[PDB]
Amino acid sequence: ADFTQGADVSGNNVTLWFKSSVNTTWVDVHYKVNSGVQQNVRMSFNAGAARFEHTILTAAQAEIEYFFTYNNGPAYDTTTFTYR
């Protein structure tokens, strides 16, 4: 169930994104910013970049622990990633 993922920055905002190469229909992010309470949010689909996205305001200088849960069409968790 291959995917790619990343964190883009514009301004001070961080956009966690997740790009699927399988039959994915929704994605949630689970994240902690600066070791705070874990947030669980379902992502949006940016057709311009053909990828799922969630933007956090004013977090470019934060540290962010996150992982995705996604379906292949019955869900799957990615390993945990860090944004510096």
Q: What technique was this entry resolved by?
A: X-ray
Nearest to 81, CA basis, from 6, 25, 1, 22: 6
Q: Which two tokens stand for residue 29?
A: 């992010």
Name 84's Cβ contacts closer than 8 Å, sequence gap at least 6: 63
Tell me how many domains the chain contains.
Answer: 1
Which of 30, 15, 8 is closest to 75 using CA atoms? 30
Q: For residue 56, what are the domain limits?
A: 1-84
CB 5 within 8 A of CB 19: yes
Resolution of the experimental structure, in angstroms: 2.0
**Cα–Cα dist 52/29, whole Å:** 10
